[PDB]
């Protein structure tokens, strides 16, 4: 059974022809022939047409070859014994540039190829989450053409945005075959994309981790009249800093599967591996299979990085490529013709109906897809039932309603509200403030027997979060869901103001003081002096309690002259500390790193099947016109002056709508510290 390998260039054919004769001379069976193709994608059609038998492909190419042509990955590459059958994607720029990861707008870019792993799928797939590139109505090509100033993306010839995506491309002696997905285009594949950066045409290049050492330090191809050095380049980290080429183990965009030999499903698999391992085994001697500098080029037949070719157990593109790979593929990849024409929003009031009605008009006049439709529902919980029932598509929910949506109805966040840095009434941190005493210091774990100042019964920061947290941490162990008696037995004395009590423990009112004349003790309103977050903080400073569970702002608003009430008139914030769940103490100004939980901003909950990137894409394109409360475009998404209501569709406090990033689940959005306390209280 002769195996006809496909070649994409003349030097690739010559290497294959020299390898074939090296094979037969060593009596290797079966025979090896080398059919020549115009491109890698042309060759996959040759394989489909039974004109050729095998080819080594990139992940994104294995994907499309396995889908639109149904070929299977039989044998794969092993680059290092360290990275194995995988490699790491990177974005590289010169030393002479300030371009960090999150500063790529209007930047000239170089890519390996369209629908290709390291030069397109991973860089663009990551940019939509953690680089902020929004895609509206599934048009990824429009998004990338507008983001980067100019680009060289081989394979984007007959696309609509060809001008921008093929602007930096040249290729060939004569300047023919420009922007073709062929080695013909001088800036094609890892080698060419890196050359695009170094020849000045582009400012950034999305290539492998190893391609910089492979084309510098004297390993530069002679044809590129130069001799590039490794220390003239740098990687870009997800954190936001520029590291060196050597620390790619820390500075990379994703770990991606290795390339593989794809053959037809009709074609035998074991026949191809036996032929190649026969050669590879005996030649590590008569023929260096993975080197290709003797033909004047890089990565011929197999990438030069390859150390060994291995058999593959499951011969399917879905199994070979990582599950993570296919997920990023189904989101970023959406058919820009088979998306629901409408996005049905959930409304809970006639003013909400009117704002949503006006929002549909403003969006449509500005040609933003999908089109909004408004469906009314009687309750926030009833919206969830209707969303999952495929009658409604989206709704904005509070922290507590996010939990019930994802855990009970399987909903997922599509976008979130983002409040002003100075606004902290909606999304704040729950903290445990204590007096600054070293000789009498204690940890969040040594709270038993102490005196506690809560804001009030059922107060989120003062009761729900802290009690919930102590139950989950295993310090308050209640019996028969009797939480009140468990906390009154844990703390020696507390102040937990309450309204309408029935079997309230005495200990929970022990520290309350009441009126200026002592009346109304422990009452659930301002009549009690220790009521609320400032009352709970006062309860602490007056030495009535030992710990106060309040909001991160409480100490600042009641110290350093910000409160001239005699009890708080002379307070300095330095006399207070915060207790962290990890056991550390911190200055009151470090609440972000030392809090019990953060009350989450609101988020738009949709069904899992709903493409979350079209939802955020619509909202981001919309907010570019209608976000700012003083925009001149005839719609304000985060204002409700025109309607007989407030916080319609979104809280009026919303400054901007944000992508969920890697908090793609209800638990991830709510945070783990916050869900632990919520779940802790449920029992």
């Amino acid at each position: 059974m002769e195996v006809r390998w496909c070649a994409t260039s003349d030097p690739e054919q010559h290497k294959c022809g020299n390898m074939s004769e090296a094979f037969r001379e060593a009596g290797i069976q079966p025979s090896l022939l080398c059919v020549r193709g115009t491109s890698a994608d042309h060759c996959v059609q040759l394989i489909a047409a039974q004109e050729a038998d095998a080819i080594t492909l990139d992940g994104g190419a294995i994907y499309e070859a396995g889908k639109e042509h149904g070929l299977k990955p039989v044998v794969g590459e092993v680059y290092d014994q360290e990275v194995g059958t995988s490699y790491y994607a990177v974005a590289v720029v010169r030393r002479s540039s300030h371009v960090t990861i999150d500063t790529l707008k209007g930047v000239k870019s170089c890519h390996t190829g369209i629908n290709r792993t390291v030069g397109w799928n991973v860089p663009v797939g990551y940019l939509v989450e953690s680089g902020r590139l929004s895609v509206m109505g599934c048009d990824v090509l429009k998004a990338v053409s507008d983001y980067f100033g100019g680009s060289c993306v081989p394979g984007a010839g007959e696309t609509s945005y060809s001008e921008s995506l093929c602007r930096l491309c040249r290729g060939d002696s004569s300047g023919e075959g420009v922007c073709d997905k062929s080695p013909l285009e001088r800036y094609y594949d890892y080698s060419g994309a890196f050359r695009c950066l170094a020849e000045g045409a582009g400012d950034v290049a999305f290539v492998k981790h190893s391609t910089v050492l492979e084309n510098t330090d004297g390993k530069t191809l002679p044809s590129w009249g130069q001799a590039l050095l490794s220390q003239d380049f740098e990687l870009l980290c997800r954190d936001g800093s520029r590291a060196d080429v050597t620390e790619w183990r820390q500075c990379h965009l994703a770990r991606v599967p290795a390339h593989a030999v794809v053959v037809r499903a009709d074609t035998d698999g074991g026949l191809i591996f036996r032929l190649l391992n026969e050669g590879q085994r005996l030649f590590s001697s008569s023929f260096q299979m993975f080197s290709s500098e003797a033909y004047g080029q890089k990565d011929l037949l197999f990438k030069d990085s390859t150390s060994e070719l291995v058999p593959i157990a499951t011969q399917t593109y879905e199994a070979w490529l990582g599950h993570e790979y296919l997920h990023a593929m189904k989101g970023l990849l959406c058919d820009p013709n088979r998306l629901p024409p409408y996005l049905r929003w959930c409304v809970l009031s006639t003013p909400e109906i009117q704002k949503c009605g006006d929002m549909a008009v403003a969006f449509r006049r500005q040609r933003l897809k999908p089109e909004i439709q408004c469906v009314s529902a009687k309750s926030p919980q009833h919206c969830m039932e209707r969303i999952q029932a495929e009658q409604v598509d989206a709704v904005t929910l509070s922290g507590e309603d996010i939990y019930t949506a994802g855990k009970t109805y399987g909903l997922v966040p599509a976008a979130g509200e983002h409040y002003a840095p100075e606004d902290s009434s909606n999304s704040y941190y729950v903290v445990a403030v204590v007096r600054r005493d070293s000789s009498h210091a204690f940890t969040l774990d040594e709270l038993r027997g102490k005196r506690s100042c809560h804001a009030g019964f059922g107060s989120p920061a003062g009761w729900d979060v802290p009690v919930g947290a102590l139950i989950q941490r295993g310090f308050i162990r209640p019996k028969d869901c009797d939480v009140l008696t468990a906390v009154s037995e844990f703390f020696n004395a507390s102040c937990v103001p309450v309204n309408n009590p029935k079997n309230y423990p005495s200990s929970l009112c022990a520290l309350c003081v009441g009126d200026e004349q002592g009346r109304n003790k422990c009452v659930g309103n301002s009549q009690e002096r220790y009521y609320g977050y400032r009352g709970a903080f006062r309860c602490l400073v007056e030495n009535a309690g030992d710990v106060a569970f309040v909001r991160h702002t409480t100490v600042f608003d009641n110290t350093n002259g910000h409160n001239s009430e005699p009890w708080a008139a002379e307070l300095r914030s330095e006399d207070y500390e915060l207790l962290c769940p990890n056991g550390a103490r911190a200055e009151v100004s470090q609440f972000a790193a030392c809090n019990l939980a953060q009350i989450p901003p609101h988020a738009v909950m949709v069904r899992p099947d709903t493409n979350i990137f079209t939802v955020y894409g619509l909202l981001d394109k919309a907010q570019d016109l209608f976000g700012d409360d003083h925009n001149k475009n005839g719609f304000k998404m985060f204002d409700s002056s025109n309607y007989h209501g407030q916080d319609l569709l979104f809280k009026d406090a919303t400054v901007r709508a944000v992508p969920v990033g890697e908090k793609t689940t209800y638990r991830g959005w709510l945070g783990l510290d916050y869900v632990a306390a919520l779940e802790g209280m449920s029992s």
Partner: antibody
Amino acid sequence: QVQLQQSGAELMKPGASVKISCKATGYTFSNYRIEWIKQRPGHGLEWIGEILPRGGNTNYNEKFKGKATFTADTSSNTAYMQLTSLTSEDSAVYYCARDDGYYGRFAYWGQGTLVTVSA
Amino acid sequence: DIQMTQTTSSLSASLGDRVTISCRASQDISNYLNWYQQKPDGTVKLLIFYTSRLHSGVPSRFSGSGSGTDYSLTISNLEQEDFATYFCQQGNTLPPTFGGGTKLEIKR
């Protein structure tokens, strides 16, 4: 103002025991720990211990343990200390002080109580 | 225990002088050091808490300084009522420990 007024000078035989008092006025007695300190000529000041009147929690200096005992009656705003098996080495000036709750600082002190052990 | 050692048990000075009394702990007490004044009638006053902060009501002539294990109290423009014994205390760890005292005596 805050004021801690202590009992008068006491004169006991060796082997006996004494109960010093310290009535507090001008603040919430239940909230602040009451420290007890001993002063002898050429022996600086020695912390005997402390008591938080809300719940009676006590912390005693090990070198005293056995000798000193603290109580506090939140209804009468008075804190007590008892010293047992008296000896001339117990003859000293004893102060009650109040812990402000911050930095281990004792902002308000008693006037002192002279205890004299003599046969 | 942490042992607080006061350099000198007695010091002489005259009105208007600048005087520095000094304390030293057996270990790093991270600035948790308080300074007290005792008059001959056994009356005790708190002057400084946490190395340098003045207790409300205390004249500004008294100033505090130090770090690590070495701390000191300074009295600027010395006045009649300042001639008394000065103690140091640590609030770093129980049991709170004091210095031996330093008596400020009138020069003549």
